[PDB]
């Protein structure tokens with residue numbers, strides 16, 4: 190009942206700094222113990238981002254524990270420590286580095302060119318699933334990782350809701366959350382729809398799941414960082430590229446799963462997005478349109494979009510390799 | 517630098533700790549500056565809660581700035597500093613020390629008993645307003661403070677949503693937020709419904725409103741602390757006490773405003789809770805029912821409830837005093 194709490198995970202990490210983090214998470218942890226943990230985490234991230242593969246794996250695994258564990262008692266300090274890593278990560282990410290604001294037209298055009306160039310729908314694995322050709326074992330690989338992307342997405346969206354101080358924009362994210370959590374029926378929440386689909390093909394849907402795929406950990410860490418960022422451009426970038434790409438991708442995945450012999454009801458997870466999302470996306474765009482004139486927003490948004498695509502592509506690459514290792 | 521950002525509010529507080537907090541909220545503030553702010557805030561709260569009236573008012577004003585300002589860039593550090601104060605505050609609150617969990621029936625009975633003993637609806641001001649004897653200006657006093665209670669309640673609910681790790685419990689709070697923010701029409705969010713009522717009776721509904729009433733600040737500080745607490749018994753206590761009391765209170769406030777010459781549409785803010793809340797309260801009860809076997813939950817819940825009633829009563833008393841002066 191605690192496999193995804195912070196302390197059990199930290200005691201299982203053959204990383205020295207895991208003990209310093211654990212001490213920082215104690216109920217009566219001192220300011221010096223917490224700041225010490227912050228210092229070791231920041232140094233570990235700096236070493237990893239400079240090319241040290243062992244330091245890279247260490248800082249990522251610790252950041253996964255800090256940002257996505259489920260013991261709320263340590264969450265505030267965990268997020269405080271996560272911030273020390275985020276500051277390094279962001280100070281290492283290629284910045285959009287506009288000196289002045291792009292036109293709204295050039296902003297949408299640049300947005301459109303990047304989405305066209307790097308969307309998950311064009312990935313060879315995606316066309317492969319669409320192709321029909323995937324074995325059952327290979328669809329299990331795909332859906333096993335779909336679970337990690339879907340099952341706590343609503344929490345990342347809630348972090349963005351919390352940071353939208355304007356009541357009408359919070360209302361927009363609330364409408365998103367309501368839809369995502371099943372409207373009036375929590376049995377129809379989108380994680381539980383995906384769980385039903387997973388159950389139909391022989392897989393478990395574990396609400397305490399802890400990933401051991403490095404590229405997947407990298408993807409979830411980045412998404413939580415972006416949705417929690419104080420400059421909501423980071424979260425709006427990730428939110429909007431998802432809400433924009435989901436319908437076409439889910440339409441083709443839906444068709445592929447019925448072609449794999451599952452029913453309309455089992456694949457409901459994909460079906461509902463095809464119809465639920467497009468109109469709400471049109472309303473959600475105003476939160477972005479409102480901010481276009483601000484170059485600080487443009488730089489946060491475009492930097493976040495580019496980083497999200499880099500980690501998504503490496504994640505999809507690793508899933509594709511795993512898929513092809515089975516038959 | 518808007519009126520409800522942290523730095524403009526801090527510059528207006530003639531307190532030395534206000535400058536230390538200001539330095540701690542700077543973009544390149546060091547860990548030493550933040551720990552200094554945290555220490556001096558904790559010491560200020562300790563001095564105020566032991567009986568230093570000026571330190572009491574001072575830490576309460578500072579906590580209002582930390583917990584409820586709207587400059588998101590400092591939000592994470594402000595909440596870190598608020599926690600240093602919360603830790604002190606919770607050591608002074610009378611804590612429920614039950615060693616064994618009440619039965620579900622005994623627990624519900626205790627809640628009902630505490631509500632019948634402490635509900636805001638029994639306050640002399642409430643009865644007086646219900647009587648139809650309130651002046652237009654007196655109703656204005658009432659609604660000015662209604663604004664402060666209503667306009668950001670959804671954010672506190674959202675903090676509880678974030679701390680409910682169970683997908684089904686997050687969903688229950690999401691349904692609450694959806695209802696609270698107007699469902700498909702943000703023009704009908706409940707803050708905007710209250711704004712429509714305030715404007716119908718000559719008042720401005722300011723989404724950057726900053727309270728200057730000490731008891732109102734104490735109320736809002738406590739409610740945000742409770743909804744943000746890592747042990748969700750605190751927030752579930754305040755959430756559930758509010759959801760339980762709102763329907764009957766709002767029906768009578770609605771009738772009283774209609775008696776005073778307000779339209780059905782103008783007073784919609786109070787009307788919509790009469791029918792929206794009773795259905796939602798029955799589904800929200802399962803969040804409490806599932807945790808009743810846990811005595812730590814019961815103690816957190818009951819301590820929250822008693823503290824909430826304490827700050828709410830002092831707040832209604834202060835509104836009542838203002839209403840009598842007009």
Ligand SMILES: O=C(O)C[C@@H](SC/C=N/O)C(=O)O
Pocket residue numbers: 335338339342369379380412431435
């Ligand atoms: O990749 C992501 O982060 C988004 C997920 S889920 C979209 C909505 N799910 O309820 C996906 O794989 O489509």
Ligand SMILES: O=C(O)C[C@@H](SC/C=N\O)C(=O)O
Pocket residue numbers: 662665666669696758762789
């Ligand atoms: O006491 C409070 O803080 C609650 C508000 S109403 C909230 C309505 N629906 O959630 C009031 O002042 O009546």
Ligand SMILES: [Fe+2]
Pocket residue numbers: 369379462
């Ligand atoms: Fe969804």
Ligand SMILES: [Fe+2]
Pocket residue numbers: 696706789
């Ligand atoms: Fe409401």
